[PDB]
Paper text:
RNA polymerase I (Pol I) is a eukaryotic, 14-subunit enzyme that solely transcribes pre-ribosomal (rRNA) from ribosomal DNA (rDNA) repeats. Although all three eukaryotic RNA polymerases (Pol I, Pol II and Pol III) share a structurally conserved 10-subunit core and a 2-subunit stalk, they have evolved distinct structural features, including accessory subunits, and rely each on a unique specialized set of general transcription factors. Since its discovery, Pol I has been shown to exist in two different conformations that differ by the presence of the heterodimer, which can be reversibly dissociated. The form lacking A49-A34.5, termed Pol I*, has reduced transcriptional specificity and activity compared to the complete Pol I enzyme.
After sorting particles with 2D and 3D classification, an unexplained extra density next to the A135 surface was observed in most of the particles with a closed cleft and strong DNA-RNA density, concomitant with streaky and weak density for the A49-A34.5 heterodimer. To better resolve this density, particles were classified using a mask in this region. This revealed that the extra density corresponded to A12.2C. In the 12-subunit Pol I* EC, lacking the heterodimer, the A12.2C occupies a novel position next to the A135 surface. The new position of A12.2C resembles that of the C-terminal domain of Pol II subunit Rpb9, outside of the DNA-binding cleft (right), and is distinct from the previously reported TFIIS-like position near the active site (left). Whereas binding to the TFIIS-like position is only possible when the DNA-binding cleft is open or partially open, binding to the Rpb9-like position can only occur when the heterodimer is absent. The second area corresponds to part of the A135 Hybrid Binding (HB) domain (residues 989 to 1000), which in Pol I interacts with the A34.5-Ct but in Pol I* interacts with the A135 N-terminal tail (A135-Nt), which folds back towards the HB domain. The A135-Nt effectively acts as a switch, changing its positioning to allow or to prevent A34.5-Ct binding to the HB domain. Binding of A12.2C and heterodimer to the ED1 are mutually exclusive, as A12.2C and A34.5-Ct use overlapping binding sites. Exclusion of the heterodimer in this conformation is supported by the movement of the A135-Nt towards the HB domain, which blocks the interaction of the distal part of the A34.5-Ct with this domain.
Residue numbers in the entry:
A (entry chain B): 460 to 516
B (entry chain A): 1029 to 1153, 1160 to 1200, 1214 to 1224
C (entry chain B): 1090 to 1139, 1153 to 1203
D (entry chain A): 1 to 140, 172 to 268, 312 to 406, 413 to 445, 451 to 735
E (entry chain G): 37 to 174, 214 to 251
F (entry chain A): 1617 to 1663
G (entry chain D): 12 to 49, 82 to 100
H (entry chain B): 803 to 917
Write the structure that this text describes.
Amino acid sequence: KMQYFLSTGNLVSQSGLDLQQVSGYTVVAEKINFYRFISHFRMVHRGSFFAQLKTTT
Amino acid sequence: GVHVSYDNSIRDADGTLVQFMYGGDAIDITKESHMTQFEFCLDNYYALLKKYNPSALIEHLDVESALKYSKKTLKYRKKHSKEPHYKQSVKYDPVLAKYNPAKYLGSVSENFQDKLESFLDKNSKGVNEKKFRALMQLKYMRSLINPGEAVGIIASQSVGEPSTQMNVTLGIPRLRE
Amino acid sequence: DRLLNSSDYTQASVCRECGSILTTQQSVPRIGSISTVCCRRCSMRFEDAKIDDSQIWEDGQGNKFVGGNETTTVAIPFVLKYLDSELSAMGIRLRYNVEPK
Amino acid sequence: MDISKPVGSEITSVDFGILTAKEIRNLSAKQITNPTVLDNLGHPVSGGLYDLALGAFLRNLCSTCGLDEKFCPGHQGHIELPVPCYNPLFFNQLYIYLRASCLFCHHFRLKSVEVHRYACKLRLLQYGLIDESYKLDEITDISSTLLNELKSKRSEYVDMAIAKALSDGRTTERGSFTATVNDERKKLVHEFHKKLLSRGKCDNCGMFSPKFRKDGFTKIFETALNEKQITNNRVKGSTYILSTEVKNILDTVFRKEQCVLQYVFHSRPNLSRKLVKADSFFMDVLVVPPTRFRLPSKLGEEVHENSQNQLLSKVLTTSLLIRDLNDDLSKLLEDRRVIFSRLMNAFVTIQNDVNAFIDSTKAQGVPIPGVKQALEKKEGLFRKHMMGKRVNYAARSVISPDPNIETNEIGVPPVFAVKLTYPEPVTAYNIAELRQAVINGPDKWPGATQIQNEDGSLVSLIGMSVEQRKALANQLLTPSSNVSTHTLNKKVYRHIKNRDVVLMNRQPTLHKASMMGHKVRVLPNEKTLRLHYANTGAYNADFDGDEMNMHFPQNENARAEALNLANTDSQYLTPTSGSPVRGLIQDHISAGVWLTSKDSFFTREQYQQYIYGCIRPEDGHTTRSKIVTLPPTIFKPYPLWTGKQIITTV
Amino acid sequence: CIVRVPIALYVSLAPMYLENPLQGVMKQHLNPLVMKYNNKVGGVVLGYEGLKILDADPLSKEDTSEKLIKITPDTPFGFTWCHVNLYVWQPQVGDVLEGYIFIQSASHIGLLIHDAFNASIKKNNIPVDWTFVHNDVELGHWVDSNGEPIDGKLRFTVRNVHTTGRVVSVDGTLIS
Amino acid sequence: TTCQFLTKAVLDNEREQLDSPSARIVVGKLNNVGTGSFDVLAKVPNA
Amino acid sequence: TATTLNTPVVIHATQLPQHVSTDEVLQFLESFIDEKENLSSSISQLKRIQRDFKGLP
Amino acid sequence: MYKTEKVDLALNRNRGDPITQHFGFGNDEWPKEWLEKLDEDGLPYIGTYVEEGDPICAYFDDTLNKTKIKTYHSSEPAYIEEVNLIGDESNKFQELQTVSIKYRIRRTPQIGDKF
Amino acid sequence: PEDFQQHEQIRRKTLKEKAIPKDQRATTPYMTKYERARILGTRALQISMNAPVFVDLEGETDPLRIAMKELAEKKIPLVIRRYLPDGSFEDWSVEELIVD
DNA sequence: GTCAAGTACTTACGCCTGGTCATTACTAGTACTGCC
DNA sequence: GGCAGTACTAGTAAAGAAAGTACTTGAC
RNA sequence: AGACCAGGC
Ligand SMILES: Nc1nc2c(ncn2[C@@H]2O[C@H](COP(=O)(O)CP(=O)(O)OP(=O)(O)O)[C@@H](O)[C@H]2O)c(=O)[nH]1
Ligand SMILES: [Mg+2]
Ligand SMILES: [Zn+2]
Ligand SMILES: [Zn+2]
Ligand SMILES: [Zn+2]
C-alpha cells in the first residue's frame, strides 16, 4: 500500500489528512540531467488545488 | 455563416438579413488602403490606369446613369444638410442604395465623393481634372467586396486576434460584458 | 478535403424512402444470382405479405422477405453513421431525405 | 475520396423525429435477451450483446448479410423492455403534460376555448403568418353556446388567412420558418406551458386533480388530496404510481386534445398527418447499437468489455429478474406482498438502468458514462470528431529559417517528399513524366508509391524490383478491356513535386493568415520545414523550436484554392485594419540602413555582383531577358555607384 | 408482347464525352442495358429510341443544341436527367408464348422463345398421359396423347418468370 | 449543451435545410460560403 | 459493375406501357441496327428477333 | 541516447503451469535469415546494428510449436549495448522469462536541434 | 407513371420560376475571386479525366496550368449559376464574365 | 398573482510529445498432507 | 490403509478559496 | 480510450 502510494501519487485515506489535495504527491526523479536531478530535492509546491484556480495572489 | 450575397447585402446562412451593404459601402478592407490616398494615385496615374484598363471596361457597364443621380444628391446635400438630422426629409437616397456599385460606374459612397470633391477642389494639377475622377471611380468599383466573403469569420477574427495583444472596466473583461 | 475527404470519407448506402444511413444492408444472394442492396425498415415479411421474383430477397438467417429496394449510395462521413447509432439508442429518428427520387 | 468514383444522390435536409417501437421491431436484426456478453472459449453467445446477427465479430462471418469484418456495416438490434419506462430526454416535458391535465375528463385544466386560442395561433406560426397571429387575438360564468361561436370565427380567420397568404405568393404549403418566427413560436409555447401548470380547478368540469410530485428522477409520486377540499369531489353528482398508469393517463389526454398538440410538436405544417402520441415520451424498447460500434479495447492481455455492454447487461439482468418475479403471480397476503414489494423495486431499477444507459448524470449508486456524455463537451463527438478531425496526407515538423526561397514557397525535407503522395490520373500529357516517376519508385524523388487501376484496385510499388517496375510503367496508358470501366484511367500516386501546393498551419490559428497556402520546393539535406522571413510575422512564428503543420491537398479543386484564393501572396494585407503583415524583419532592416546610406559606394565589380545575386533572370525575376544597369553616380576619377542606385535597378 | 415505355433516367456523364453528350449517355448507360432484364420496367430491354437530354436551364428551347450539365462539386462527372423510349419484351403469367424447342430431356422440355430467350416446361406441369421413351442412340422424344413425338413449336400458358439469375427464364405450364 | 438543443429539435419535429457551416460538416456537404456559393454548369454542344 | 458510372442513379417509367404491334417492332429493329452497326453480342441477338417476325431460320 | 525496454515472456499465465515460451530456437523450419542479429540463445549480440523490422529476440512457443520472434518497433536505428538476464527468485528454480535490453541511438547534432 | 409525371412538372415549373432571364439579371459583370478558383479547379479535374482540350499544349503537363491557359483565350465551356438567397439563380457563362 | 433569495446546470486558448499505473475481496472448491 | 484439517486456487461478484441564467419554493 | 505526472511553442 506504500508501493501504490509511491508509484501513483494517489492518497488513500479514511481519516482524511489535514491537507487539501488527494493526488500528485510523488514525482519521477528524471535523471535527464544533473541540474534536473538536484532540482527535485529543493523544489517546493503549494498544492494541486492552487493550480486549477483563478486568483493570482 | 454570414457572408456577402450577390445582392452585395450580407446575410446569414438560413437567409435572414444582417445588413444591406457591408460597412455601408461594400468595399474590402484589403483593397481600400490607397483608395483615399489621392496624392499617391495622381503621381502614379499612368501606371494605375494600366491595371484597371478603362477603355476595355465600358461595354459591360452603365457609366451614364449612376453619375447623374450622384449629382442630384451632391447638389441636394450641399444645398440642404445645414439643419440637423431629424429635420432632414431626405427625398434622395445615396447611389449605393439605388444602384449596384459593382456594375454602375460612379456609384460610390458619400465620404468617397465628399473627399474626392474636397481634394480635387483645392489643388489644380498631361492629366486633367476629369480623367482623375474617372479613374478613382473605377478604382472604387474594382475595390468592391466580392460576393461569398466569409465576413463574420473575418469580423470575429479581427476582434479575437487583437484581443491577445491586450475608473471604468477595461479590456477583455469589458468585451465579456 | 481536410474535414471530409481525407479524414473519414465513406460512400455508404442510404434508403431513399426511409432516409436511413444504418438500416439498409447487403442481400444474401442465390447460386448465380447477384447481391442487391436492400432495406430492413420498409421491407415487409413474406408470411405477413402473403410478387415478381425481383422484389424478394433473403437474410443470412434464412428470413426470406419482400420489400424496399429503393436505395442508393451517398457520400457521407463515417462519424455521421456513428452519430445515428448513438442517437437511435436515445430513441431519436433521423430521416436523411435525398434529392433524386 | 476518389474523383473517379462519383455520387449522384445528395442529402438535402434532415429532420429529428421520435423513433417508435413498431419500427424498431421491424428494423431489428435479432432481439438480444441474456446478460452474458461472450461465453467460454472466446465465442459470442447467441442471444447476447456480442452476436453474429448484429455484425461480424472477431474473425467470423455475419449472420444477417454474411460478410466479414471489413465489409459488414453492423446491424440494428433491440431488447424488449417488459414495462414502458421513462425516456430521460423527454421527462422534463413528460412531467409538464402529466401535470396540468385533468384526470377525469382528460383535457387540460384550462378552459377549452383558451386551449383553442393557442391551437390556432401556433398554426399561423407554422406558416409564415407572424403578423396574423396577433389579429387573431383581437377577437372577443359564460354559457357554452357563444363559446362555440367564438371558436368558429377564430377558426375561420385562420383558414382565410392561410388561404390568402398561400395564394398571394408568400407562404408555401410546407410553411415558412425564418428566424424571427422561431422567436414568436418559442415565446408562445413557453407562455402556453407556463399557463397550463398554473391551474387550480379543471375549467371544463370543475373539480380538482391530485398534484404530482417529482423529487428526483427515476420516480413519480402523486400526493393525497387535502382534508378541506374533498367536498368538491362529493358534489359532482405519497403514493408511488406505475409508469403504465402514467402512460394510461396520457394516452387519453393526447387523444381528447389531438387538435391542439399537433401544433405544439410541429414547427412546420404536418404533411404526413401523423398522430402525436404518449408513446413518444416513453420507450418500451431499447435499441442496442451495432456491434461494430462497441468493440472492446485491447492492450495485450488487458482486454476490457465496453462501457455500453456494461450498461446494457444491467438492463438485461433486471429484465430477467422482473420476469422471474412474475413466476409467483403466474402461480397464484404474505405470499403476495413479498413478491409485489420486490416487483415494484424492479420497476425502479430498470428505470435507473435505462437512465444510466442514456445519461450518466441521471444515475445513482466515477459512474459509467452514458450515451449523452459521448456527445456533450470538448472530448465529445460534435467537437472532437465532427468540427475537428484527424486527417490523412499531412505532416508536422520543426521549422528552420531559410533565405533563397521565393517568399511563397515552403522548403520540404526529402523524407516528407517520399511519404506524401498525390493521385495523378494518366493522360496523353503525363506519360512522359509520370512514366519516369513510376520507374523511379517509392524511394527516389520524384517517384511514386502506388498505381490505382481502373477497377478501383491498387498496386503498391514498395516490394518490387526495378525490372518488375518498368513493366508497370508500360501498363499505364492502355485501353481498358472492361466496357463497364472504359472511361476510367489509371491513377499513379506520384510523390510531391516542386509544382504542388501545400497548406501550412501554426497553432493557435488566431486569424486566417495563420493558415496559408504555400508553394513547394524540395531540399536535399535535412528533416525540417523551411520558412521564409516574410511569413514569420503572419503565423507569429519564431524559430526557438516552433513546429507547424503541413496539409497536402488531394484534388484540383483544392490545388486551385491554395494557389489563387488561400494563397500566401493574396494575404499581404490583413483584413483587421488593412495593414500589411508581411515583410523583412531583423537583419534585412539593419542592412538597408547601411546600404541606402550616403557612405555606401560600390565599384563596377561590386555593383554588378549584388544585382545578379538577387535578380537571376533564368529563374524568372527579371522582365527584360537582359539585366539593364544605370550610369554610375560618379564618373571621375573612377566610377562609383550608390546603394540608392542598387535598389533603383533592383 | 413487346411493349413501349417512355422513361426518365438520371445518369452521369464523364468528361471524355463533353463534346458528344448523346454518345456518352448511350455507351455508359443505355448500351449495357439492352438484352438484360431491367427491374424497374418488368421485362428485357430490346433497344432504345429517341434520347433527349433535359437542359438544366429552362429558359432555353428543346430546339437548342447547346445544353447544360450540372457538374458534381467533388468529381468532374456531370449529372443530368434524360428521356428515352424503351422497347422492352415483357412476359407475364397467363400469356401464350410460341416457342422453339431446344432441349430434349426427361427433366424439362427446354424451348427458346424468339430464338433468344430461354424457357422450360416443368414435369409436374406436364399431365400424366404424355409419356417419354428410352432412346439409347441419342435424351429422346415425348409421346403425347396422340401417340407422336413433339418437335418444333409448343404453345403454353405462362406459370412464372425467372428474373433473378443471369438470363431470363419462363416457367411455363401446358394445362389449363 | 448538445442534448438540450437535441430535445428541443425532436420535440419540434424540426427539419433543417443544412444551411449553416456547422450543419454541412456534420452531414458532409460543400459550404455555401465562398467557392461553394454557386454551381458550375457545363455547356455541351449536342442536344 | 453496378456503379453510378454504369447504371442510372434513379430510373422511373414516366408513362404507362402501351403495346405496340408487329409493324412498329420490325420498323424499330431495321432502324436500331441501322444506327448502331453503322454490344455486338446483343446485335447478334437482335437479328434473331428481326429474322423472326419476317422469316424462319 | 540510451533507451531500455524489457522483453518479458511470462505476463500471460499464472500458477505453476508449464512455461509455454522458451528463449532460443526450436527444431522446426524457421528461416535462417536472423542468425545475423540473434545468438543461439534467442538473444541478440552485443554491438549489433538494428533498424526497424529486425528481431529483438527469438522464442520457441509450445502451444503453437513455432519459433516466434519479437521485433524492434522503432523507426530510428539503434545499437545494442547490454543484455540483462533477469532471473526470478523462488524456491523452484526457473528458466529465464525476463530479458532487459539497452539501446544506444547516435544523436549527432542535426539542424533543428535546440542549443 | 402518373405520380412521377406530375412530380416532374412541379420540379420543372418551380425551377423555371427560379430562373432569372438574361436581360433581367443584375449581379456583377466581373468574375469574382471565388468563381475563378472553382472554374480553374473544375476544368482541371475534367482535363485530367480526358476532356477535349480546346487550347494548344505547349509542353505543360500540369492540368491546372492548362485550365489557366484556357481562361486566357476564354475557351472554357463552363457556366456559373449564381444563386440568390431566395433560391433563384442567374446563369453567367465564363465568356461573358470579365476578369480583374 | 407576486416579489424574492435560494437551488441548479452551464462554460472556463490552440495542439504537440513523452512517461506511468490502471479490481479486489472472498468464497467455495479440489487437492495436499498429517494422522491413526 | 483411508479420514479430515489446512493451505491454497481459481473462481465469479462489488468498487476544500471563480463567473452567469434559469427554475422555483419561501411568505403574504 | 481515461487518470495523473513531466514537458514543447
Ligand atoms: N497559444 C499559445 N501560444 C504560445 C504559448 N507559449 C508560446 N506561444 C507562442 O510562442 C511565442 C513565444 O513567445 P514568448 O512567450 O516567449 C514572449 P517573448 O518575450 O519570449 O518574445 P521574444 O522575447 O521576442 O522571444 C509567442 O508568439 C506565442 O504566440 C502558449 O502557451 N499558448
Ligand atoms: Mg517560439
Ligand atoms: Zn426503406
Ligand atoms: Zn452483417
Ligand atoms: Zn375536468
